[PDB]
Amino acid sequence: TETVGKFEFSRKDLIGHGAFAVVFKGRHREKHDLEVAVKCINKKNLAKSQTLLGKEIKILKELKHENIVALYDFQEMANSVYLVMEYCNGGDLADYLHAMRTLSEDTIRLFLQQIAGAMRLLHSKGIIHRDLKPQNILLSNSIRVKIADFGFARYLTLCGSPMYMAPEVIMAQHYDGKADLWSIGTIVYQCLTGKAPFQAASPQDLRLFYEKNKTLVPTIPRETSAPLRQLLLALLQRNHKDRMDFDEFFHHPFLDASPSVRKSPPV
Ligand SMILES: CC(C)[C@@H](C)NC(=O)c1ccc2nn[nH]c2c1
Numbered sequence: 001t002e003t004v005g006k007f008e009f010s011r012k013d014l015i016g017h018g019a020f021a022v023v024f025k026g027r028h029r030e031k032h033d034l035e036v037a038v039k040c041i042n043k044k045n046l047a048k049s050q051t052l053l054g055k056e057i058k059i060l061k062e063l064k065h066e067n068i069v070a071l072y073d074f075q076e077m078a079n080s081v082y083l084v085m086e087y088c089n090g091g092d093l094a095d096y097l098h099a100m101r102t103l104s105e106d107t108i109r110l111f112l113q114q115i116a117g118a119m120r121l122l123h124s125k126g127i128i129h130r131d132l133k134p135q136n137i138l139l140s141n142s143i144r145v146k147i148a149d150f151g152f153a154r155y156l157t158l159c160g161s162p163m164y165m166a167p168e169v170i171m172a173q174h175y176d177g178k179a180d181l182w183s184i185g186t187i188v189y190q191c192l193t194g195k196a197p198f199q200a201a202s203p204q205d206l207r208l209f210y211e212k213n214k215t216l217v218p219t220i221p222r223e224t225s226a227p228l229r230q231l232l233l234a235l236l237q238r239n240h241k242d243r244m245d246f247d248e249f250f251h252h253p254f255l256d257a258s259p260s261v262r263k264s265p266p267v
Pocket residue numbers: 015016017018019020021022023036037039069085086087088089135136138148149
């Protein structure tokens with residue numbers, strides 16, 4: 001059993017693994033029923049991992065929201081760094097989509113309302129996440145959504161998953177918070193259809209695709225509701241000048257419950 005301050009964990013309880021972090025389920029050492037997640041360095045990418053976890057500490061100290069993973073404690077050592085965080089017991093959106101294949105528009109609305117709340121705070125603070133993808137949208141059991149993985153966040157060297165990155169980011173142009181809105185659009189599209197809207201054989205081929213095609217239109221199924229169709233077209237604008245801004249996103253009709261009134265749940 002390893003310890004970080006008043007918290008402990010076994011590496012048997014591996015719950016997350018990225019290029020730049022390994023995450024374990026843990027517990028409070030005094031209150032054994034208090035579950036946590038302990039985010040550690042990935043030694044395969046030590047230098048970068050250390051840098052990113054350091055940055056994440058600094059960002060999350062400033063960010064407190066019900067839809068952003070909470071930071072409870074942290075320790076920074078010479079060759080290692082540890083973040084003690086809110087445990088999310090429902091895995092991530094990547095696992096969920098693999099299992100479900102596609103989500104109902106109602107489920108999408110439920111998750112996106114929560115994302116939108118978190119993003120509202122980022123917007124106010126002038127923070128861009130830059131690495132939004134299904135792997136860092138965490139679920140917790142009434143499914144709560146929490147945005148994680150803030151190591152790449154900046155106030156107004158990125159690597160991750162180019163299929164979720166805005167054209168201006170891929171093309172090494174100026175970007176702002178609207179780059180996160182593109183990412184959200186791609187995620188929403190994937191929840192709806194099971195696939196990313198724009199794919200290529202390689203990151204370089206995706207760049208070439210975005211460079212060549214000054215108008216990008218995602219293929220939205222005929223059966224998609226008018227509000228969701230409109231939202232997806234506006235989020236997935238190639239040129240950020242044309243892309244929906246945060247205000248318009250936050251107040252979009254799709255982010256209101258449909259149906260507005262339903263049955264009370266089965267007894
Ligand atoms: C695997 C990493 C690269 C990343 C995507 N996961 C996390 O940062 C993470 C953070 C807090 C959590 N609390 N419960 N589960 C969690 C997972």
